[PDB]
Design an enzyme around this catalytic site. Structure first.
Site, PDB file in Angstrom:
ATOM      1  N   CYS A 230      -8.387 -19.927  -6.128  1.00 12.54           N
ATOM      2  CA  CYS A 230      -7.015 -20.126  -5.728  1.00 12.54           C
ATOM      3  C   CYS A 230      -6.749 -21.567  -5.248  1.00 12.54           C
ATOM      4  O   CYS A 230      -5.703 -22.130  -5.542  1.00 12.54           O
ATOM      5  CB  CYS A 230      -6.594 -19.180  -4.594  1.00 12.54           C
TER       6      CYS A 230
ATOM      7  N   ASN B 122       1.706 -18.320  -7.272  1.00 10.36           N
ATOM      8  CA  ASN B 122       0.366 -17.762  -7.096  1.00 10.36           C
ATOM      9  C   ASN B 122      -0.462 -18.009  -8.396  1.00 10.36           C
ATOM     10  O   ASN B 122       0.059 -18.534  -9.379  1.00 10.36           O
ATOM     11  CB  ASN B 122       0.492 -16.253  -6.638  1.00 10.36           C
TER      12      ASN B 122
HETATM   13  C1  LIG Z   1      -8.532 -17.902  -3.280  1.00 12.03           C
HETATM   14  N1  LIG Z   1      -8.886 -17.315  -4.340  1.00 12.03           N
HETATM   15  C2  LIG Z   1      -9.479 -17.829  -2.159  1.00 12.03           C
HETATM   16  N2  LIG Z   1     -10.586 -17.095  -2.370  1.00 12.03           N
HETATM   17  C3  LIG Z   1     -11.498 -16.988  -1.402  1.00 12.03           C
HETATM   18  C4  LIG Z   1     -12.707 -16.109  -1.615  1.00 12.03           C
HETATM   19  C5  LIG Z   1     -12.313 -14.704  -2.040  1.00 12.03           C
HETATM   20  C6  LIG Z   1     -11.467 -14.016  -0.957  1.00 12.03           C
HETATM   21  N3  LIG Z   1     -11.208 -12.547  -1.077  1.00 12.03           N
HETATM   22  C7  LIG Z   1      -9.895 -12.274  -0.483  1.00 12.03           C
HETATM   23  C8  LIG Z   1      -9.608 -10.786  -0.443  1.00 12.03           C
HETATM   24  C9  LIG Z   1      -9.871 -10.014  -1.744  1.00 12.03           C
HETATM   25  C10 LIG Z   1     -10.844 -10.604  -2.763  1.00 12.03           C
HETATM   26  C11 LIG Z   1     -11.431 -11.989  -2.437  1.00 12.03           C
HETATM   27  C12 LIG Z   1     -11.280 -17.668  -0.203  1.00 12.03           C
HETATM   28  C13 LIG Z   1     -10.149 -18.496  -0.039  1.00 12.03           C
HETATM   29  C14 LIG Z   1      -9.808 -19.265   1.210  1.00 12.03           C
HETATM   30  C15 LIG Z   1      -8.721 -20.149   1.175  1.00 12.03           C
HETATM   31  C16 LIG Z   1      -8.308 -20.864   2.295  1.00 12.03           C
HETATM   32  C17 LIG Z   1      -7.146 -21.812   2.222  1.00 12.03           C
HETATM   33  F1  LIG Z   1      -6.901 -22.201   3.437  1.00 12.03           F
HETATM   34  F2  LIG Z   1      -7.371 -22.921   1.533  1.00 12.03           F
HETATM   35  F3  LIG Z   1      -6.056 -21.221   1.748  1.00 12.03           F
HETATM   36  C18 LIG Z   1      -9.001 -20.684   3.494  1.00 12.03           C
HETATM   37  C19 LIG Z   1     -10.078 -19.803   3.533  1.00 12.03           C
HETATM   38  C20 LIG Z   1     -10.493 -19.093   2.409  1.00 12.03           C
HETATM   39  N4  LIG Z   1      -9.260 -18.531  -1.030  1.00 12.03           N
END
Ligand SMILES: *C(#N)C1=NC([C][C][C]N2[C][C][C][C][C]2)=[C]C(C2=[C]C(C(F)(F)F)=[C][C]=[C]2)=N1
Length: 215
Positions: free
Chosen positions: A25, A182
């Site tokens: 993402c 998105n």
């Molecule tokens: C996006 N894509 C994304 N992915 C992750 C790892 C997978 C997270 N997980 C969520 C629930 C269901 C399935 C997978 C992590 C992050 C992430 C992004 C940010 C940001 F601040 F940049 F937006 C911070 C922390 C983690 N994004």
């Protein structure tokens, strides 16, 4: 409409993408803000490579997540990012295969919106273009979005867990919003998009981790 902008109508926004099963993402948020600045600076854009970021931004975790600021830092330091056509999306992390002959955009740094300031975010969107934003995307209600302006009292502005791209703002039926791109495919949401609550006390942390690239 007065006091609104939609960058999709101005040619700043590429088609909605699908990250697949990969947690990239942040790479889609980052290429999105870069795409917008390409159009701003040169008059045209093309799809830039998220896979270039997933594979080569070693400060992030590939398909395990990451930050847009790190991607911007990478494009600056690397003197380029390849096009999507030069370095296509495969949906898993691979070795870094950046080649400068596929280079399609450059970055001279980035700026971050003051934390939690939606008014600052709106001026950024108005004066820059598409802005990378982080949100709490964890709720069922976020995931099943289809229509209207999204607001859920359960959204946690301190649980930022998903990266998206603010591509405009406006009002719909009296409800102020952000237009949010998105990376879960065009099938998700409203053709890949969600309208999120604007000026409702920083709903889902929308103004908590916002940045754009300098170009
Ligand atoms: C996006 N894509 C994304 N992915 C992750 C790892 C997978 C997270 N997980 C969520 C629930 C269901 C399935 C997978 C992590 C992050 C992430 C992004 C940010 C940001 F601040 F940049 F937006 C911070 C922390 C983690 N994004």
């Amino acid at each position: 409409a007065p006091d609104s902008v939609d960058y999709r109508k101005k040619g700043y926004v590429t088609p909605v993408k699908n990250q697949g099963q990969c947690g990239s993402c942040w790479a889609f948020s980052s290429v999105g803000a870069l795409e917008g600045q390409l159009k701003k600076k040169t008059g045209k854009l093309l799809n830039l490579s998220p896979q270039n970021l997933v594979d080569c931004v070693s400060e992030n975790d590939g398909c395990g997540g990451g930050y847009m600021t790190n991607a911007f830092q990478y494009v600056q330091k690397n003197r380029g990012i390849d096009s999507e056509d030069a370095y296509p999306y495969v949906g898993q992390e691979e070795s870094c295969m950046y080649n400068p002959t596929g280079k399609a955009a450059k970055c001279r740094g980035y700026r971050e919106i003051p934390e939690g300031n939606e008014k600052a975010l709106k001026r950024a969107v108005a004066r820059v273009g598409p802005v990378s934003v982080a949100i709490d995307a964890s709720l069922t209600s976020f995931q099943f979005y289809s229509k209207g302006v999204y607001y859920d009292e359960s959204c946690n502005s301190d649980n930022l867990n998903h990266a998206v791209l603010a591509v405009g703002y406006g009002i719909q039926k009296g409800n102020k919003h952000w237009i949010i791109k998105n990376s879960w495919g065009e099938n998700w949401g409203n053709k890949g998009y969600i309208l999120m609550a604007r000026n409702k006390n920083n709903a889902c942390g929308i103004a908590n981790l916002a940045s754009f690239p300098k170009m």
